[PDB]
Write a protein that binds this ligand. Structure first.
Ligand SMILES: [Zn+2]
Ligand SMILES: [Zn+2]
Ligand SMILES: [Zn+2]
Ligand SMILES: [Zn+2]
Lengths: 80, 80
């Protein structure tokens, strides 16, 4: 038999569960909820190609939100 | 000024346009059309709570069709 050990699709921290249609950590869930609810717009200081990992997840909020969307987190699942 | 860069509401792939009342990729448009036209019924092997992302979009057809409907894709907009 086997355990499936899920990693956050956005940053690679261990996930806490399924949040808005993506397997994610609490930090990325909270970041996504806040970005969607508050209609936050961000800009990447570089080439919109930043690395997102658990080290400094929030160094580039633009690229972190992009990765949420590319990894299938659903803005429309955030109740408002 | 800014660009709005739409993601498929069902899987998070880049959308190709508005199809049957939802911003969706070609794969999810085709899946929805076929599901509605052919009156396809599916069953989820798990707890009707599967993740839908671009990685293995069709791993759970039940959950993919549910997400199409939850995200506002309209069966009634599929011509017969
Ligand atoms: Zn994370
Ligand atoms: Zn960036
Ligand atoms: Zn799609
Ligand atoms: Zn399923």
């Amino acid at each position: 038999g086997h355990m499936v050990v899920e990693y956050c699709v956005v940053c690679g921290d261990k996930a806490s569960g399924r949040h808005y249609g993506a397997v994610s950590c609490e930090g990325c869930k909270g970041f996504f909820k806040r970005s969607v609810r508050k209609n936050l717009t961000y800009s990447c200081r570089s080439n919109q190609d930043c690395i997102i990992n658990k080290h400094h997840r929030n160094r580039c909020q633009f690229c972190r939100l992009k990765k949420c969307l590319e990894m299938g987190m659903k803005m429309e699942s955030v109740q408002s």
